[PDB]
């Protein structure tokens, strides 16, 4: 079993039936895009971010590491390569909690980011590398 089936199965995704998002959730975003807030730890910086709410959890941290990597005169092609990179290499993870966004859903499909956005909060996420969260799965 690869390492992300067992951190699939010890935290599987907590999503709703249907990536439909229903009226009246729907109709609290912008234009169909929800504002996020993406900690990384550098440290802590955080980024704030407007994004579709059908983006899937890979497509997020895209978008954090262009936010964070603008105004460090990278090239187009570079932007490209260190999204390739950040993109394998982390995951996002809900801050103050052990909910982790491995599957391939819209983020808007977790119960989380719903829940955020019925009830008027910020979701905060946290940037986390995958082989810290793979540290945390049981020891043989």
């Known amino acids: 079993n690869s390492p992300h089936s067992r951190a699939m199965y010890v935290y599987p995704p ?3 039936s249907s990536p439909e998002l229903p009226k009246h959730i729907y109709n609290k975003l912008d234009k ?3 504002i996020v807030v993406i900690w990384v730890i550098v440290d802590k910086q955080k980024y704030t971010l407007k994004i579709n709410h059908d983006c899937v959890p890979e497509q997020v941290i895209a978008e954090a590491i262009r936010k964070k990597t603008r105004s460090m005169l990278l090239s187009s092609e570079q932007l490209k390569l260190c999204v390739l ?3 394998g290499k982390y995951i996002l993870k809900v801050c103050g909690c052990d909910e982790y966004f491995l599957e391939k859903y819209p983020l808007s499909q977790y119960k989380y980011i719903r829940s955020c956005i019925m009830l008027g909060r910020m979701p905060n996420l ?5 082989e810290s969260l793979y540290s945390q799965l049981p020891m043989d």
């Open 14 to 16: 907590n999503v709703e």
């Open 32 to 34: 169909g895009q929800i």
């Open 85 to 87: 990179e950040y993109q």
């Open 126 to 130: 946290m940037l986390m590398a995958k």
